[PDB]
């Protein structure tokens, strides 16, 4: 579970494990795929997707997911998590605002991202309905058995941990997690690399002038922009994405039927939608003479139909056609 710098972490820029990168309000189904720097899913070892492992300290905390909250302008709905990554059904929102509850603390993370949800169709809803026609939307999956893409996930760079740099009663005293690789020296001249167990520091004294580092590359990370490079190498760790964008047919929009009214080679149409509906036509002469107008306000319109025919498209309701001799 990677940890990075959340931008407006409740107060201001903290370093949250759930630091939000790559917000994708690019689908249609009320859904956003998000990456936390935290890797929830199974535990550290082997069990139960519905548990929760973020970083506390240098360490993980692979425990229950109890009170996740993604949210935006309104509280979102989770869809599924896998890896670093969560899918959640959100409404539109100027921002994105994520957070669980460990239990002692709220411990959330928030971010800017322009979000919208147009459904696919000539109706510009704000939200998916219960009914209407199905038609080919873009949307992310529920599932994990997924390989359609993979993002590079090589090592972490080092990280700071000044909990290490204690004092040896006059000298600044570094320690190690588990024998991990601590990269160490101070502004003064003393040990210059640091690949060690718990060292002391002969020369410097102040904690604030030393290299508290953790080369702990036993587990790779996501290659966040808010990661410091592991300077050594491009290690392996090519790793999939679960939530591929797929060609789901969203349960989708439908605009109320029109009121057809006859006139001489002319369609008066008293019209009354639910939401802004893009109407348009095609006078089937080799003179096309089409028309487009989003209609949200109910409006009686007109169409000079010709002899050979016109067609009529009340939103994603199917196209009509008309003989006006």
């Amino acid at each position: 579970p990677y940890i990075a710098d959340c931008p407006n972490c409740g107060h201001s820029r903290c370093d949250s494990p759930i630091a939000i990168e790559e917000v994708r309000g690019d689908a249609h189904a009320g859904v956003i795929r998000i990456q936390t720097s935290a890797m929830f899913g199974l535990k550290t070892d082997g069990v139960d997707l519905a548990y929760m492992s973020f970083m506390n300290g240098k360490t993980q905390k692979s425990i229950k997911i109890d009170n996740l909250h993604v949210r935006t302008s309104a509280p979102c709905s989770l869809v599924s998590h896998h890896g670093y990554y969560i899918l959640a059904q959100c409404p539109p929102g100027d921002t994105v605002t994520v957070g669980f509850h460990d239990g002692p603390n709220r411990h959330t993370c928030t971010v800017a991202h322009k979000v919208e949800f147009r459904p696919v169709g000539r109706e510009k809803y704000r939200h998916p309905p219960e009914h209407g026609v199905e038609l080919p939307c873009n949307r992310y999956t529920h599932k994990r058995a997924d390989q359609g893409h993979y993002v590079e996930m090589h090592q972490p760079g080092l990280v700071a941990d000044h909990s290490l740099l204690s004092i040896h009663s006059a000298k600044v005293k570094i320690t190690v997690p588990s024998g991990a690789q601590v990269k160490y020296y101070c502004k003064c001249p003393d040990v210059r690399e640091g690949i060690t167990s718990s060292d002391h520091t002969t020369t410097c004294t102040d904690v604030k002038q030393c290299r508290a580092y953790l080369i702990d590359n036993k587990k790779w990370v996501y290659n966040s922009g808010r990661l410091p490079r592991g300077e050594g190498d491009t290690f392996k760790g090519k790793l999939h994405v679960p939530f591929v964008p797929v060609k789901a047919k969203c349960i989708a929009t439908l605009a109320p039927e029109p009121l057809v009214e006859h006139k001489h080679r002319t369609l008066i149409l008293h019209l009354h939608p639910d939401h802004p509906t893009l109407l348009t036509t095609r006078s089937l002469g080799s003179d096309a003479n089409p028309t487009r107008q989003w209609i949200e306000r109910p409006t009686t319109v007109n169409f000079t139909v010709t002899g050979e025919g016109l067609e009529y498209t009340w939103g994603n309701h199917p196209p009509k056609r008309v003989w006006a001799q």
């Epitope: 535990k43 070892d45 300290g57 240098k58 360490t59 993980q60 425990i63 024998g179 991990a180």
Partner: antibody
């Protein structure tokens, strides 16, 4: 059911190499990786690392990155510990162990090395 | 770079309830430390008891249960038996490696 039976105890003069085998029985090798633990005469128990018996990647504890090398005769359900350029203070007992159930569930019998000229 | 601490020795009598604890030097022990309890009987004989704080290995008597008490992992033997006289070690996970405690020598009347 699960038996991890280890090689017998060796004697080796400083500088030598040793390959300690751990032959696994009762489980499907591949879904459970191996922990190598050092219980040094006085000092108590210490994690030496873990090997992904599926991919084959080893993790070493920092104390063990270097002279220690984990490998596996996959094919025969064996994991092996190799300690090269034996130092005299490596006399101790090494256990293989199965990582499962959010911890370790089965331990082997131990292979004790006595580094001595 | 973390130090697990355990009681040194504990003495009980057959039939009693005894608790062993496992303390982490970095902070409270939590479920993401996946406390493990291992028993060492004489002859370099190791068996795992509990894993992931409270999962009892299969074929380990029910008198054994694990939990978190306060800020530490605990092992309770309910109805200790003479057979339980051994060394109990706790192990804690720290995001990338395992740290073992010093072990508790438990003595049971019998």
């Amino acid at each position: 059911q699960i038996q991890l039976v280890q090689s017998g105890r060796e004697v080796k003069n400083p500088g030598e190499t040793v390959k300690i085998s751990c032959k696994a029985s009762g489980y499907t090798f591949t879904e459970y990786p191996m922990l190598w633990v050092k219980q040094a005469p006085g000092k108590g128990f210490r994690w030496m690392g873990l090997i992904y018996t599926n991919t084959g990647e080893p993790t070493y504890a920092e104390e063990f990155k270097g002279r220690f090398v984990f490998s596996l005769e996959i094919s025969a359900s064996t994991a092996y510990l190799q300690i090269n350029n034996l130092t005299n203070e490596d006399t101790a007992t090494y256990f293989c162990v199965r990582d499962y159930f959010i911890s370790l569930d089965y331990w082997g019998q131990g292979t004790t090395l006595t580094v001595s000229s | 770079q973390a130090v697990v601490t355990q009681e040194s020795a504990l003495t009980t009598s057959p039939g009693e309830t005894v608790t062993l604890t496992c303390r982490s030097n970095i902070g409270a022990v939590t479920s993401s430390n996946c406390a493990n309890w291992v028993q060492e009987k004489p002859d370099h004989f190791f068996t795992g008891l509990i894993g992931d704080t409270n999962n009892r290995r299969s074929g380990v008597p029910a008198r054994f249960s694990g939990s978190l008490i306060g800020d530490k992992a605990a092992l309770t033997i309910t109805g200790a038996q003479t057979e339980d006289e051994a060394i109990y070690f706790c192990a804690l996970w720290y995001n990338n490696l395992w740290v073992f405690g010093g072990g508790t020598k438990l003595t049971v009347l019998g």
